[PDB]
Amino acid sequence: LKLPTAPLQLSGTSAQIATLLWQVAAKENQLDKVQDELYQFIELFKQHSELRRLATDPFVPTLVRTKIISSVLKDSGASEITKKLFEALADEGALSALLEVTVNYEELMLAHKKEVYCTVITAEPLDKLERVELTKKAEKFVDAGFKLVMQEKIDKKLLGGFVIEFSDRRVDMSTAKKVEEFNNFVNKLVLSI
Amino acid sequence: PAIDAGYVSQVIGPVVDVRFDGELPSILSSLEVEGHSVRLVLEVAQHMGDNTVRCIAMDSTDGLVRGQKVVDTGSPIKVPVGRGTLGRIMNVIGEPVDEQGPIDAADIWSIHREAPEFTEQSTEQEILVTGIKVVDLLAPYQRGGKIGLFGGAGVGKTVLIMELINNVAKAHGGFSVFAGVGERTREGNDLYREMIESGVIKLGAERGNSKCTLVYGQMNEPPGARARVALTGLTVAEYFRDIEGQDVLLFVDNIFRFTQANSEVSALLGRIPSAVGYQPTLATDLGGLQERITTTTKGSITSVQAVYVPADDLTDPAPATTFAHLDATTVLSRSIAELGIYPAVDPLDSTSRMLNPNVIGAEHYNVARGVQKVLQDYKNLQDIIAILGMDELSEEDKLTVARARKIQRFLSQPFQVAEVFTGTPGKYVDLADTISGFQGVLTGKYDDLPEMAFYMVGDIKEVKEKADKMAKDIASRKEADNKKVSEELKDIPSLDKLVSEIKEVVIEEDDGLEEDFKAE
Amino acid sequence: ADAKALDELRKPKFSSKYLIQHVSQKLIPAVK
Amino acid sequence: EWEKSYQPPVIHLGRVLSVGDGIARVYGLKSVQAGELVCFDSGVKGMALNLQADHVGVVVFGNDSVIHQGDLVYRTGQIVNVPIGPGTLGRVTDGLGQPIDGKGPLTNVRSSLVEVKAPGIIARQSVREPLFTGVKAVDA
Ligand SMILES: Nc1ncnc2c1ncn2[C@@H]1O[C@H](COP(=O)(O)OP(=O)(O)O)[C@@H](O)[C@H]1O
Numbered sequence: 068l069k070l071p072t073a074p075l076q077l078s079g080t081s082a083q084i085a086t087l088l089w090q091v092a093a094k095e096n097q098l099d100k101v102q103d104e105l106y107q108f109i110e111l112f113k114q115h116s117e118l119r120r121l122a123t124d125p126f127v128p129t130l131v132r133t134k135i136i137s138s139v140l141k142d143s144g145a146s147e148i149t150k151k152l153f154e155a156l157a158d159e160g161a162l163s164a165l166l167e168v169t170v171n172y173e174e175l176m177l178a179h180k181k182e183v184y185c186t187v188i189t190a191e192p193l194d195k196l197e198r199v200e201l202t203k204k205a206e207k208f209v210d211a212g213f214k215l216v217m218q219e220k221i222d223k224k225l226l227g228g229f230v231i232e233f234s235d236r237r238v239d240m241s242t243a244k245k246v247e248e249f250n251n252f253v254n255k256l257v258l259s260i
Numbered sequence: 261p262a263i264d265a266g267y268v269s270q271v272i273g274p275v276v277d278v279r280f281d282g283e284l285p286s287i288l289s290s291l292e293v294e295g296h297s298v299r300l301v302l303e304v305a306q307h308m309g310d311n312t313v314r315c316i317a318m319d320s321t322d323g324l325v326r327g328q329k330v331v332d333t334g335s336p337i338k339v340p341v342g343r344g345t346l347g348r349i350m351n352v353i354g355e356p357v358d359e360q361g362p363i364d365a366a367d368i369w370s371i372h373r374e375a376p377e378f379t380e381q382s383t384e385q386e387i388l389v390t391g392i393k394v395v396d397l398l399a400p401y402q403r404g405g406k407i408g409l410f411g412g413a414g415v416g417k418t419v420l421i422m423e424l425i426n427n428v429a430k431a432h433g434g435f436s437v438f439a440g441v442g443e444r445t446r447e448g449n450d451l452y453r454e455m456i457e458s459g460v461i462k463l464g465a466e467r468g469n470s471k472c473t474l475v476y477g478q479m480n481e482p483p484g485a486r487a488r489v490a491l492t493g494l495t496v497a498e499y500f501r502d503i504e505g506q507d508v509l510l511f512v513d514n515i516f517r518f519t520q521a522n523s524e525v526s527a528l529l530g531r532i533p534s535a536v537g538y539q540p541t542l543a544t545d546l547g548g549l550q551e552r553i554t555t556t557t558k559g560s561i562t563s564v565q566a567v568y569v570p571a572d573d574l575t576d577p578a579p580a581t582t583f584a585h586l587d588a589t590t591v592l593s594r595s596i597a598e599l600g601i602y603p604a605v606d607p608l609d610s611t612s613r614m615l616n617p618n619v620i621g622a623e624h625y626n627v628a629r630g631v632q633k634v635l636q637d638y639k640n641l642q643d644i645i646a647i648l649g650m651d652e653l654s655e656e657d658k659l660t661v662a663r664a665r666k667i668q669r670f671l672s673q674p675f676q677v678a679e680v681f682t683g684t685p686g687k688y689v690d691l692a693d694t695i696s697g698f699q700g701v702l703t704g705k706y707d708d709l710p711e712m713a714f715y716m717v718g719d720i721k722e723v724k725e726k727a728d729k730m731a732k733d734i735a736s737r738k739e740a741d742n743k744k745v746s747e748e749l750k751d752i753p754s755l756d757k758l759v760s761e762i763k764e765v766v767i768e769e770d771d772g773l774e775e776d777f778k779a780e
Numbered sequence: 781a782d783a784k785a786l787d788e789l790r791k792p793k794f795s796s797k798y799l800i801q802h803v804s805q806k807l808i809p810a811v812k
Numbered sequence: 813e814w815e816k817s818y819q820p821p822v823i824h825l826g827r828v829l830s831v832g833d834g835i836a837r838v839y840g841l842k843s844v845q846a847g848e849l850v851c852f853d854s855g856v857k858g859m860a861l862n863l864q865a866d867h868v869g870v871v872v873f874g875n876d877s878v879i880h881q882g883d884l885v886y887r888t889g890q891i892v893n894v895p896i897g898p899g900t901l902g903r904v905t906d907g908l909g910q911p912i913d914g915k916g917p918l919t920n921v922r923s924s925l926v927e928v929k930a931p932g933i934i935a936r937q938s939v940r941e942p943l944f945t946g947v948k949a950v951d952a
């Protein structure tokens with residue numbers, strides 16, 4: 068009808084649940100609410116074995132599955148989107164999809180807060196000025212005003228500089244790739260001259 | 261730019277799935293990809309179900325990313341039609357490919373329409389004399405009918421289509437449309453240059469007096485373009501039939517390539533395959549294309565389509581489905597071509613709806629049926645002639661064999677478009693000349709001539725001319741060798757006089773290849 | 781969906797427990 | 813001038829989902845082109861054949877036994893190309909343009925795409941001059 072558009076397009080039939088779950092929780096402004104509510108079921112499936120029986124065992128009747136999920140979620144002040152969500156999955160037996168809806172609900176939440184989790188590998192641990200140099204140098208790789216969240220790792224095989232691991236792509240600003248790319252360019256230029 | 265702009269969801273060769281956020285395009289509507297190396301036009305084939313359409317690209321999809329914005333034109337592929345398309349070349353999407361500027365468009369028509377209805381059909385059987393003996397005798401063409409030339413891989417169904425162009429199209433008066441679907445680009449350039457020389461296509465300021473539109477979707481094109489260029493040529497013919505209201509000729513070289521290009525696409529549209537490996541929607545695709553190529557009450561389309569047969573198999577479904585849509589069938593066979601008989605038309609497999617005694621007359625139909633009876637009676641004698649020898653038939657049987665070997669050679673003919681690679685002049689034979697000559701061979705007036713008197717001649721006068729031309733040849737032995745060359749006085753110079761005239765060429769010192777590769 | 785984002789769901793990330801401590805108070809009678 | 817104009821290009825990663833039957837399924841590579849030459853971390857190249865919604869079908873130019881699930885696939889940014897030029901004359905190359913005669917790298921050469929559209933109707937002319945094969949059954 069008239070829903071807020073998702074922050075990024077996604078795959079089929081499991082991310083399309085999480086896109087639709089994001090699109091109705093945004094009209095309710097309960098985006099951080101149900102992302103907390105989805106996470107609580109993932110630990111709940113870790114605790115009880117009689118609850119993840121309703122998602123894997125193919126011999127529970129589809130009446131008993133949809134009654135137990137309703138008979139538990141009458142209460143507790145869970146959001147009315149999720150107690151409508153879990154009744155949609157219990158009627159269809161798609162309770163196994165919750166582990167894949169949650170990882171597709173995450174990057175919708177991540178691209179709504181416009182954060183991107185990266186990883187910095189340097190030769191030595193940084194200064195507090197070297198970090199603010201690195202942040203504005205690494206802000207040329209994201210495509211908007213994204214709040215970059217760095218992680219710091221150490222590799223002394225790099226001889227100074229940094230690499231960024233965005234988990235989609237990688238930029239190698241280290242001096243090790245600089246000197247080997249330099250030597251490749253030199254040894255290919257004397258191949259012609 | 262949010263709505264009415266979808267993005268490329270996935271790319272499987274020539275099949276592009278485009279995802280729209282809302283308000284999807286219709287099926288058959290054309291879309292445009294933004295920021296491609298050439299103009300990439302997609303045409304929507306299916307609604308896949310989750311705000312995704314599935315399209316067929318009219319150019320190559322090499323270089324598409326799965327995020328590219330795709331704008332919707334809100335209409336099918338619309339090509340220019342009119343009288344300003346005459347003497348031009350168009351591709352599948354209507355762009356000019358002759359470098360003669362933009363196409364002056366009397367209208368911009370969609371390439372998709374329905375067939376004309378039942379009440380617009382016209383049932384008028386008038387003959388079309390082609391000048392080809394086997395065609396005019398045994399399977400006469402309808403003036404306003406659909407004509408099919410069947411045969412596979414070098415039997416001569418392009419030389420037959422060029423002889424039909426040269427004979428019919430020059431003496432027509434209406435317009436022509438050549439739709440080259442899946443053929444050689446060398447042949448399309450040959451036809452374009454040959455039509456410039458003949459004045460059928462004029463360039464520049466006198467361009468509007470041209471009589472032909474070329475629409476070329478040749479075999480270097482991706483399968484989205486070859487599957488849809490016959491529709492573009494059909495639309496250019498349909499404008500002249502409907503709006504200008506006149507008789508046109510549509511020559512489609514290899515309408516089989518339309519079926520083949522849909523068969524290439526349909527493996528990736530996610531369908532169960534039909535028989536031999538073709539698409540399930542073969543007969544309806546071919547039918548919906550062919551049912552637009554008709555004569556109506558408002559105009560005429562004389563359609564000559566060459567049909568390729570795969571592996572010389574007529575039971576392949578793409579020729580066997582084409583057989584029903586055609587009025588005149590001309591089946592060219594490979595063994596008749598290996599006998600040297602050109603045009604290699606099988607006379608016992610080519611048919612016509614004009615071969616009817618109420619249409620072409622009584623003596624024409626009787627001569628045609630008599631020639632086919634002699635040829636069938638000879639085909640029934642092939643096994644015993646092969647394994648027992650000619651010397652063991654009856655006398656009427658070996659009269660039938662001789663008359664059939666005469667009328668097999670007499671059905672061949674030198675073509676005026678083949679005179680550049682044969683050396684024989686082309687021989688347009690009139691229809692009355694064909695009927696008179698074949699009646700002469702059938703009754704027995706010409707049991708006296710040799711067999712090779714009939715090979716590659718025009719008509720029944722030229723068999724007698726060639727008979728005296730080849731029986732003066734066995735008497736052609738002249739005296740003294742007629743030398744007049746032995747020591748010609750100051751007419752034949754010496755060799756070093758002749759080497760003294762030949763120019764010295766300069767040999768440019770080890771190929772010069774690195775000096776100009778570094779020029780760029 | 782991917783795998784490397786889906787291995788991180790083996791870690792507790794709930795940041796609130798008004799459901800995990802509620803459901804065990806009501807799951808066992810419902811399944812019994 | 814090379815060192816003053818030096819930009820470490822953002823290498824786009826992608827894991828391998830599933831390899832075997834001569835074709836890898838590659839997770840990731842969200843910006844890869846159809847028909848682009850991708851490079852596995854084993855040094856074996858590939859061609860992004862089917863761009864799907866959830867993976868990329870990569871046909872592997874070489875033995876696919878060196879590809880594992882979890883290998884990284886770096887895209888090279890260009891449609892499948894071979895080095896063309898006068899520096900190829902005399903050289904025995906494999907099907908991707910890499911020399912196999914052991915005579916070093918192809919010097920004086922330039923990459924161009926292998927999938928080019930043939931020249932159109934207005935780009936040809938008629939074939940006039942002969943090409944003598946030196947076989948007199950052929951040339952006669
Ligand atoms: N009418 C003809 N007369 C003589 N030779 C012919 C004729 N038609 C075809 N040929 C021979 O066979 C070849 C195939 O001709 P073409 O019409 O191009 O066949 P197709 O288009 O079916 O491959 C020609 O190159 C020529 O050698």
Ligand SMILES: [Mg+2]
Nearest residue numbers: 417418443444
């Ligand atoms: Mg041909």
